[PDB]
């Protein structure tokens with residue numbers, strides 16, 4: 001059973017002029033189904049019980 | 050150290066890491082599990098006796 | 099709405115992190131993974147037909 005449920009993030013330094021725009025494009029892709037597509041083509045393969 | 054501007058990889062968001070560098074919103078919610086070998090069924094019936 | 103209008107500092111609760119809201123109010127680190135799910139009644143599976 002799952003424990004220590006902390007996800008994966010794109011890490012940058014404190015200054016990070018891309019900080020705000022990176023997280024929004026991650027959120028937007030979540031709502032756009034973009035990460036769902038990348039989930040299928042790289043993770044969800046099955047072909048094994 | 051400045052050799053990288055970004056970390057595009059499975060970096061989990063930790064308190065220790067988040068104190069120094071900053072993370073975007075997660076692109077992959079996950080956690081910790083255990084990996085164990087599949088148990089191939091095989092009867093221990095030595096003989097009919 | 100009550101954080102945008104400076105009526106309260108924080109908006110704790112079951113708020114979902116959205117792209118639209120993040121453009122007006124800045125969220126925090128998620129403490130619960132959420133999303134979308136679909137609720138359907140039980141359908142059973144019976145037994146295999148070649149026992």
Ligand SMILES: N[C@@H](CCC(=O)O)C(=O)O
Nearest residue numbers: 111112113114115116132
């Ligand atoms: N949980 C959503 C509202 C409920 C829904 O999904 O409709 C939110 O925080 O805005």
